[PDB]
Paper text:
Atrazine chlorohydrolase (AtzA) was discovered and purified in the early 1990s from soil that had been exposed to the widely used herbicide atrazine. It was subsequently found that this enzyme catalyzes the first and necessary step in the breakdown of atrazine by the soil organism Pseudomonas sp. strain ADP. While AtzA is a hexamer that contains one essential Fe2+ per monomer, TrzN (which is ∼25% identical to AtzA) is a dimer that has a single Zn2+ bound in each active site. Although it has taken 20 years, a crystal structure of the full hexameric form of AtzA has now been obtained.
Author numbering:
A (entry chain B): 3 to 474
B (entry chain A): 2 to 474
C (entry chain E): 146 to 310
The structure:
Amino acid sequence: TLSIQHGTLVTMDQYRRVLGDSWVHVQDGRIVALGVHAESVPPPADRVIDARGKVVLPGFINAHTHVNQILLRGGPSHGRQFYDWLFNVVYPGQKAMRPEDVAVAVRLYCAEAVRSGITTINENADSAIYPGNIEAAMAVYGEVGVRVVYARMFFDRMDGRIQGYVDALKARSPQVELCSIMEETAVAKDRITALSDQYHGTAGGRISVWPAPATTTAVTVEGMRWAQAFARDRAVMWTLHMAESDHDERIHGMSPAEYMECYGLLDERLQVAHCVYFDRKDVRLLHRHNVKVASQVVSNAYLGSGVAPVPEMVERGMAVGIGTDNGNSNDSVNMIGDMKFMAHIHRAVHRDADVLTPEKILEMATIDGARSLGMDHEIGSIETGKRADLILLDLRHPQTTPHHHLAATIVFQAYGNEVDTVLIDGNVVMENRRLSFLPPERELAFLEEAQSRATAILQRANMVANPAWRSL
Amino acid sequence: QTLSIQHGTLVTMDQYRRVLGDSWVHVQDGRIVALGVHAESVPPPADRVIDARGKVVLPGFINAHTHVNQILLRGGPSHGRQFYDWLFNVVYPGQKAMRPEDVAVAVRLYCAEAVRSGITTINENADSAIYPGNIEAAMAVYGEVGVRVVYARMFFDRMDGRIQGYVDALKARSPQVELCSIMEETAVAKDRITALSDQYHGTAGGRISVWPAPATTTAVTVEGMRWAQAFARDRAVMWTLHMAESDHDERIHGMSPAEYMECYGLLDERLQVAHCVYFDRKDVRLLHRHNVKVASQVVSNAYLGSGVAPVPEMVERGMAVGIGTDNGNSNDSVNMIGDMKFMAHIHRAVHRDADVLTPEKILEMATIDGARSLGMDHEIGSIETGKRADLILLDLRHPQTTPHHHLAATIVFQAYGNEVDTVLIDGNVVMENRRLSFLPPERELAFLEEAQSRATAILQRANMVANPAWRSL
Amino acid sequence: VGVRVVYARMFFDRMDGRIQGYVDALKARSPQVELCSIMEETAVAKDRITALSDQYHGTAGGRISVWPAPATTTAVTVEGMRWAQAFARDRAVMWTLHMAESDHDERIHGMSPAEYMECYGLLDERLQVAHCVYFDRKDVRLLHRHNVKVASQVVSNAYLGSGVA
Ligand SMILES: [Fe+3]
Ligand SMILES: [Fe+3]
């Protein structure tokens, strides 16, 4: 049992209560009780965590990300439109990674993520097809203690239209191999079903498995319908990348949202990612079927895609979470940095300093994010009965001083290093910035290994790591 | 007295943009005296050696336009408001309620944040210099801290009567907060600024400079702007003005502020303009023609709902565009690395062009081009012989900055702003292993509590709401 | 007749001087038709509307109701709008105003009428606004936030060449 005491609790509960000098009691992975110190004595606990002078929040929820690609950041990944990045960087880089590289990628990602207060990660696994990768990744997620949705991507249909464009893009890095990860529909089903049977609900309920048809052009109608029915039969969600680029825009003369509507493929268990190339009608169609959304505001900028209509969706009460997207289209895994970006980009583009409140941005990173993953009954707020995914932030630093309104301070001032202590499913995963799965005496050597492995991955893939200085 | 920084990777920002692995820098009497590569040359003897092994050495970051004292108004009171709403309901009244002893604490807090993020030069646009005691309080702290400072003394000498019914409506949003005026007579502004320059310009070993700062083209007379212009020329400094930050500035007398200034011969190579959001192609051509310097406040232009300035166009014309963090309470951080990432992304998003500004270019804007925007590029902004020793040491051995191959990309797209370890300004160690010379670790927490209290009290005296009720929509 | 009727009594208590040279030009289209004024002093509008409400509100078997109706945000003072707002609250009715029907209404003092009303706390759940043609995304958000009611005059917005809300 664990008692967190004397903090300010930012509950994100139904009344958005903010409780000064208050406590939380945790038992068997759950929040069992809460109270105010002046009115009540906290129950006895095996241990007390002192949060005096600190702010307690629900853990941040990364609503859509791609983990293993983190080893491709730091030089190779920037300055390219989506498809250029995909074909010259992501596909070949992923392919050159071995299972032992994956294990290091995952631990590096989880170290950055937990340090920034992320406790749930929706991993869209585009490299699950390669032998050994699932097993390597899953062993590290389990050990680390993070809550993970492992959304297994598949592609079962050739999009032949885009080929002369692809060859031109490939000529930018001709020594880098063009890859294919297409699989037959029935093979994808069997592989995802077996993955779910083996890993879903493992690591004490912390790991889930979803089917992830990649896009409306890369997956057949049958494949998407299978994913849809699978989500329904197993009480999970299914997810798809929607309208991330201007070449996706026209699946057969209508938008991807329209196309899915025609086939009855929009439902309340679908979470779509991106939605940059969206019009009013598309928003209406998602709204009507209660589709969940993950917005990758930073990555949409990094890749030169654009700006999604998040304010419109939010004003319709839609469940919109925030994803950091790829470890190499951001290039950080920092929810607080992404929140600030979500606040500012929309203000700038609408010329409206009040287009999204910092409270609302904080909601997107917590309780609404949970809702976007279909997990809001279990996580995303500090409420009795929910899982004990909790973070303690210290605002006593120069950047976060002064602080009066907590959501404003967090969104507009915090850098992302203010998170001290992190609980996931009631287990202490970080304490005073010390990571339980990467102790301080191993941290530097681990980073050097990740650095070396990245350098080697890029050599095997024939990718340029450090292009010559260019001002224009 | 001498200092040797050894075994770092030097990101010089010099004329060839040299990046020198396992290299050294020798510092003497506030100046970079020599550099070299360890494998080809032995460093000169020095009184002390700073070991930068495994670290990256950069020129110090340059904050090309900011407002310091306002930092005590962040944390609740300042967000969610268009420029004029923010100005009249927050900034003016908040500043007015601050006493000199509050100003001293504001300045130290700002400098602590700034130095911790690698900022070594600050262009402080002082909008509260009119209040007795404020200059002296601020200057003593800047001096003690060791930071390089341009103190640009803002003035307003003309009523802009057009915007009054708009102002009253805006004031009704916070009716208990007092409307207040900082207008002065032209001649009084001139005398005050001249005296401030005579007393403080070149002080603190040359670290402190004084510029005149006519506020805007509507708040200052032609005569006031011409005086500022001539003053800059006679004293070999710059003058600065806020340009086209909002859609209500846009029309000084039926043309843009740039056109208006052109008409009166007020665009010249010693002018540094701030903002330039409401700018068209012609305005950019006019600034370009006269070699006007520009400070872009990309983050604040978003925060205040103003928009996005045409930075790519200016940069492609070779113009000197620096990056400013702007107000301590329209950002609301003082973090150059965070703002660089925002500069990189906002423009990519708006142009739908992932390559619209390279991370190298963004790093140039924060260093050598920033120096150029202040007219100080002969003295600072690059690691070159003869220039001042304003240098920062970054450690990239953290999760977020791993892996790292291309340094500018890593810094711009991965660094959070806490990776700066050690900071030199004018050759003096102002920060070492994150320990601040002017705010030692055993005083830090108590100082932050005092800033917090003083802020709470400032807001009470001004009748400003600190912590508005939770609002989702 | 037996119809259910809300009688929203319009008033105007403030001169909008800005639009006068425009008005004279318009008047020259029919110069023999006289230019009229229906302005009243604030206190007179209040007394008249109060007396009308006391006399007719709830009559004809509850079929007739009386609301105050400040005409627009440029033709009524802040004090007049606030009185209407409080009157609606005290008597459990609504108040109503014409909003942003034309491109010359658009700028009450350098912001939209919705913004102007928000500044003074004049958007609430008992307000019903009419028209909303010259409205942007921010205006819609402001109304939504305060649960303002809306009447849309789609045919008339066409007939008069205003546009489409
Ligand atoms: Fe994605
Ligand atoms: Fe400014």
